[PDB]
Paper text:
The JAMM (JAB1/MPN/Mov34 metalloenzyme) motif in Rpn11 and Csn5 underlies isopeptidase activities intrinsic to the proteasome and signalosome, respectively. We show here that the archaebacterial protein AfJAMM possesses the key features of a zinc metalloprotease, yet with a distinct fold. In this study, we present the crystal structure of the Archaeoglobus fulgidus AF2198 gene product AfJAMM and explore the implications of its novel metalloprotease architecture. Unlike many JAMM proteins that contain an additional domain, the AfJAMM protein consists entirely of the JAMM domain.
The zinc-binding site is adjacent to a loop that spans the end of β4 to the beginning of α2 and is stabilized by a disulfide bond between C74 from this loop to C95 on β5. The two AfJAMM subunits in the asymmetric unit are connected through a parallel β sheet formed at the dimer interface. AfJAMM behaves as a monomer during size exclusion chromatography, suggesting that the dimer observed in the asymmetric unit is an artifact of crystallization. The catalytic zinc has a tetrahedral coordination sphere, with ligands provided by Nɛ2 of H67 and H69 on β4, the carboxylate of D80 on α2, and a water molecule. The latter hydrogen-bonds to the sidechain of E22 on β2. Nonetheless, the active site metal and ligand atoms of thermolysin and ScNP can be superimposed on those of AfJAMM with an RMS deviation of approximately 0.4–0.5 Å.
Residue numbers in the entry: -1 to 41, 60 to 119
Write the structure that this text describes.
C-alpha cells in the first residue's frame, strides 16, 4: 500500500550523514514493493534520493528542487544534528510527504 522506510535504512542514513558532516551526504533510495530498505551509493528501480545539510534545516534548497525531478518520487533531507527527528521527505514537486517507519 503506502510506502514506508525500514528502521535499519533510516539508522544507516543518519549515521552516514553524521560521518559526512560537515560535508553533505548524498545517495539513492530503493527497495522492493512498499518498503524502502536499499541504500545505493554514488560512484534497478530508484525510489528516490537522500542527502544532508550541515545546518538545522530540512528545507529544500534551490538545487534540491532540481534534484527531486530526476531520481524517483521520494526525496529525503536529513539535517544537523541528524537525530531521528532531523529528516523530512518530499516528492518531485517539493511538497512535504509523510513517510512512516516500519514497526
Ligand atoms: Zn539540499
Amino acid at each position: 500500500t503506502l510506502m514506508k522506510i525500514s528502521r535499519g535504512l533510516l539508522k544507516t542514513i543518519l549515521e552516514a550523514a553524521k560521518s559526512a558532516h560537515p560535508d553533505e551526504f548524498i545517495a539513492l533510495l530503493s527497495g522492493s514493493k512498499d518498503v524502502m530498505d536499499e541504500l545505493i551509493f554514488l560512484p534497478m528501480k530508484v525510489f528516490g534520493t537522500v542527502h544532508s545539510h550541515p545546518s538545522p534545516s530540512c528545507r529544500p534548497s534551490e538545487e534540491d528542487l532540481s534534484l527531486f525531478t530526476r531520481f524517483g518520487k521520494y526525496h529525503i533531507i536529513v539535517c544537523y544534528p541528524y537525530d531521528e527527528n532531523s529528516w523530512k521527505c518530499y516528492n518531485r514537486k517539493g511538497e512535504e510527504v509523510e513517510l512512516e517507519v516500519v514497526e
